[PDB]
Each structure stands twice: as structure tokens, then as C-alpha cells.
Amino acid sequence: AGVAKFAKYPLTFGPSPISNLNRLSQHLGSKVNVYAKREDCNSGLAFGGNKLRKLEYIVPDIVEGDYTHLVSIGGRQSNQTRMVAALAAKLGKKCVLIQEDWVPIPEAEKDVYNRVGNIELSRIMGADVRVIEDGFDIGMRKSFANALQELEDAGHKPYPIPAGCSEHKYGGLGFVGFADEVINQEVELGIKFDKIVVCCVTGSTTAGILAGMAQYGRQDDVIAIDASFTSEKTKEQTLRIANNTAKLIGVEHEFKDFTLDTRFAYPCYGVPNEGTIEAIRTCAEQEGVLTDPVYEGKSMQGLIALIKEDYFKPGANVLYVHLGGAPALSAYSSFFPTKTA
Amino acid sequence: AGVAKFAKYPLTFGPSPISNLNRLSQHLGSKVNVYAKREDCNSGLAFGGNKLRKLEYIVPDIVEGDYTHLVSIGGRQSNQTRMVAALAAKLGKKCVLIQEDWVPIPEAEKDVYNRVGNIELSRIMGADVRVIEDGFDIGMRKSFANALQELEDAGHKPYPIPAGCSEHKYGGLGFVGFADEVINQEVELGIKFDKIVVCCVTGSTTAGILAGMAQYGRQDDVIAIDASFTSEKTKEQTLRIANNTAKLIGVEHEFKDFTLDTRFAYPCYGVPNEGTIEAIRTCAEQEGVLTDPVYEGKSMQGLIALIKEDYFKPGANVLYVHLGGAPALSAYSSFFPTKTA
Ligand SMILES: *Cc1c(COP(=O)(O)O)cnc(C)c1O
Ligand SMILES: *Cc1c(COP(=O)(O)O)cnc(C)c1O
């Protein structure tokens, strides 16, 4: 057990704060005391987000080697690519982004879904944005490899950074350190978290939290809420990340399965459902905390669905993980009509 | 010297962090050392910002008596209105927001300027968003006074929060604390800031820094960048707010004038110029830090312009203030096209 033996490059202000969503708690029945560890309030690098914690353990490599281009990938409103662009800017490197079509671009948004939001930010930061229309997949894509081959054949030295970092060698280390962090904040705040709720589609964030919590034998505190509607590969990939990461940090524990509620992924990746939107609104109306229609919105409804059904013990302290991703909210404007008054 | 006598309700994580923009500073010929105090990363209340800091000294008054509605006013992509919603949602009060027509909505941005960005956020937080046609003015608005009367007629108890909280009785207290944070942070940093750059439209931000920095006899360290294009009143109100506040905290010194660079407001409030777009792109390409076409993109272009002309002593430590506004960026995608490689 030790993430400390790995090189880390600072890209955040330090330990992400924890918000006490006490008002939302009461509203939901006062059954559980909901808390939120603000990863969305990460750093000053283009709004921040969980993906920034992941990159901290990857940057040292980039810097140590002689690289000129940082290439990543993801869907249109990809949070990843947007943070890879901000990072590339900070390191003074070139940036290439492969924006594939992973979400059935809603009609009433087909004219902005590819111009406004996160994709706009990658542009403003000077990244070679490329709009391809390949299928959705949380695994290695055959457009990422070609981009690499291209820049290489061009005489450039590209740095591969897979979807959400997840499948990167050190993709699970950032959230191992997340675990060490919650453990300390529990003592500083004086509150123990009985459970941890976090969204999941490509893996690393969940896997990292599992392998990292294992350090204190608490992997079972984790509660993942699928948002990829493909629990199939999402659980198997998250599980494989959890193992390869546990090995890296000295954890013996072999992960064979984890809590992966799949009741709110539908209708698919990127497309909210009537429940998602209501969750976002309730969270926002009650706390002033925004959540997106793709990730955190679906994990927030799951958090509310669970609370409704007395899934947690009476008076439980549950740590909701806000991974950010709000900036893509402007590409789903059509789903939030003005509140009747 | 007495901002402590007044009550304060916590709305931010704590004293804002100061980023060291060394890469940008090198880009601008290593003329000075640019630092940026991050008000744009000060809270979890939907992106937070400078207005939230102002509000901390106003919330106590609110909760004390009995008000049911918080009312404020600003343009379509207003930041203040959006932060008032979050404040209201959190305080569990209702929200009525007047969204005047303060900006000539670009032709390309006509089908979005009112459905995306800040406005969308206020709607998700269930605020009563009222899109009005009145024009730009940093002074008390008719639509405002009408709202107070309307709601008050319906048997409600609205709380009046003018534009940017600037004209509020305590709208200046906020940044008088910013001055305190600055001096303390110079100590913890082991360096002294020679000058402070900060955007200025409705007044209270700059006004509070002036009365605060004056506690130590350092008002002349303040350098405001106007983005209203109506210097005359912007300088008139800012100067009045700064004078009232000064008396509240006990500062005798009377402000008769202050540094207000107006070279970058052109062509008008809410609209960037090729220079702004250039600054936003420079800061983003160098630090991965995002600024807005309306306010900060101008404070930033001015900063760059001032450095070039050798306005500061060589090696000076210049504290730029990032007040936020980046969320409104989605309403200007037309201006930022994919850069060529
Ligand atoms: C990228 C992202 C996720 C998914 O993280 P995984 O580690 O890939 O499960 C969830 N929420 C937000 C806001 C994200 O940006
Ligand atoms: C409100 C605001 C300002 C202006 O503040 P004043 O105190 O009115 O000068 C500047 N920048 C941003 C991003 C703002 O939201």
C-alpha cells in the first residue's frame, strides 16, 4: 500500500473540498446526511474535474520524456479532451483531440451540440480538434492509433492518453490518492463516510477509489452508478483497472466484483432520461450545485433513488463524488424549460 | 480597518488561491511576474465568482429578518443573477431575476445567447427568470423597482439585490476583506504585490479593494480595466461606493479619483474586440486558464497591453484578479473557431 512511491505533478489547488449538502438532505427525508467531495472545484485549469486528479500521476512521464503532442479522445462534449487541452497548454505542448460521435445528437440540439460546451473550450485553448463520427466505446478505438501513427510519421513525438485516462498504466493512481485524502478529511472534519457514491463509464475513477479504499479494507464502501448503459464492458474494464492498480500500489486484495447499480444508464450514453433531469433540478434547486445530463446527473438521481428506498442505514453519512462535467450543460439546454414560475 | 465588525455568512471555500502564471509571464517577454487571485474558483455554488464574495456580507441581513424572495438584475448572460439563484436556492428562498437586454446579441449568437450559458443555469436552479427588453445601465433599474412592488403586492417579502450588489449598502465590504487576504497572502508568499489589475463595470469589486488597500495606505496600487464602455458613470459609481464603504470600516482617506484604463471596453459592454479574442486565446494557450469575452477577457487584454508598453517596473509582481465569468463563454462560440495547425 503506497501511491507515494509514484511521481506526481501538481495540477490542483490541493485536497478537493467537501460540501455539506445539508439542505438537500432534509428535502429528501432527512434519512441520510449527504456530503459532496468537490472534484469539480479541482483547479484553475479550465474549470477542473476528476480527470485532473488522474493526470497528476501521468504528467511526470510526459515531462521526463521528449514529447511534443498530447493526443486523447472522447465523445463530442468530452470532459477529458477539454482537460487534456488545458494540460497541454500548461506544459507548453501541442494538443490533438479526436471527438467521436458517441451520443445520438438530440435533434433540438443538433446545431449546438458540436459547437458549444466543452468542445468550444478545447478550441479556445488551441487544440487540434477533429470531429469524427465513429461509434461509442470505452475501450481502445481505431482512430486514436491512426492519429498517433500520423503525427509520428510526421516526425512528431505524440503521447497517448486513452478515453478518460482509464486504460493508461497510471490511470488508476490519482483516485488511489483520492482514497488517502478522504481518510484524512474524515479526521479533520470529524465525520465518517459509510458509503461513497460515484458515476462510472470508463473505469479509473471507480477502480482507483476501490483499490485505494482497499488499503483500509473499505472497498465495500464504494457504490458505482453506471452511466454508459453498457454494464457489460464497464464492469469488466473497471474491475481490470482495479486489479492492475492494486498491484501497483502494493494491495494484495483481488477484486472480483463491485457495486455497479445499472438502473439509471438508459436510454444510453449522453442521453438523459426523465429521472436524470429531475435529479439535476432537485440538486440545483436545493443546493445550488449543478450536475450534467451525461454523468453526474445520472449518478445524482441514483443517489436519490437509493435514498428514497432506505438503502442506507438511518443517519448514514454518504459521500457523493462530484466529478464535475457541468460545462457540457449548455449542449443540453433544450431539456430544462424555465420553471413554471 | 474594521470589516470585522460586520457579520459574514460563509459562501466560499475560504481565502481565494493565487495561481502563478509564470508561463504567460515568460510569453510576455519576462517583463513582470504575473499572479492571478482566483475568485473564479472560490465556491461550489455553481462556478462561484466575485459576486459571491460580495454576497457574504449581505446574507446575514437577509436571514435575520423575514424575506421570501431574493431579487437581483443584470444582462442576459449575467453572472450576478446566476449567483443570486444559487444563493437563494441554498438559503431556501425564492428567486426572481430580471434579465435586461444589455448587449447587442451577435447575429451568429441570436439563437443561443438566451438559451445557453448563465441564463440556463439560473433556470435549472429554478429561479423566476424574466427576459426584459430594457437597455444597459449600471444604475437602479425601473424593471427592478417594479418587481419589488409586484411581489410585495402579492403579499410576499422580497429582498433587493441591485446589479452586481454594487449599490447595496454593504456591497463594498466584500472586497475590503479581499484587501486583507492580499496582505496576509503576501506574507505567506514572502513577496509583495506592486500592482493589482481588476475588471470593473458596476463598481463594488474595485471599490472594496480601494477602501481596503487604503487601510494600509496602498490605494494607488489598484488598477481597474473598464469593460462597460461608459467610463464616466462606471468611474462615478465606483468612486461613490468606495467612499461610503471607507466610512463604514473607519478609513478616513477620501477617494476623489482612481486608475481606470478604458482602452479596451470598445466597442461596447458585452462585445469583445479582436484584441479580447486574442487575449482570451493567449491566456488559454499559455496557462489553460479561461477568461470571458465580456469582462475578464478585456481585463486580460489590457493586462497584456500594459505589460508590452512597459507600464510596470521590471520584475514587478502584478496580481491580476480573475473574477470568473467563464460560464457565459458558451454564448460566444462563433468568435472562437478551431485554430489551424
Ligand atoms: C469523465 C467523467 C466521469 C467518468 O469517469 P470514469 O473514471 O471514466 O468512470 C464521470 N463524471 C464526470 C463529470 C466526468 O467528467
Ligand atoms: C460582476 C463581474 C465583474 C464586475 O464587478 P464590479 O464590482 O461590478 O466592477 C467583473 N467580472 C466578472 C466576471 C463579473 O461577474
UniProtKB/Swiss-Prot annotation, chains A, B:
Disulfide bonds: none annotated. InterPro entries: ACCD_DCysDesulf, ACP_carboxylate_deaminase, TrpB-like_PALP, TrpB-like_PALP_sf. CDD domains: ACCD. GO terms for biological process: amine catabolic process. SUPFAM superfamilies: Tryptophan synthase beta subunit-like PLP-dependent enzymes. The modification N6-(pyridoxal phosphate)lysine is found at residue 51. Keywords: Acetylation, Hydrolase, Pyridoxal phosphate. Transmembrane segments: none annotated. The keyword Acetylation applies. Pfam families: PALP. Its cofactor is pyridoxal 5'-phosphate. The modification N-acetylserine is found at residue 1. Gene3D superfamilies: 3.40.50.1100. One of its GO terms (molecular function) is D-cysteine desulfhydrase activity. Its EC number is 3.5.99.7. It catalyses: 1-aminocyclopropane-1-carboxylate + H2O = 2-oxobutanoate + NH4(+). Catalyzes a cyclopropane ring-opening reaction, the irreversible conversion of 1-aminocyclopropane-1-carboxylate (ACC) to ammonia and alpha-ketobutyrate. Homodimer. PANTHER family: 1-AMINOCYCLOPROPANE-1-CARBOXYLATE DEAMINASE-RELATED. Belongs to the ACC deaminase/D-cysteine desulfhydrase family. This is 1-aminocyclopropane-1-carboxylate deaminase. It comes from Cyberlindnera saturnus.
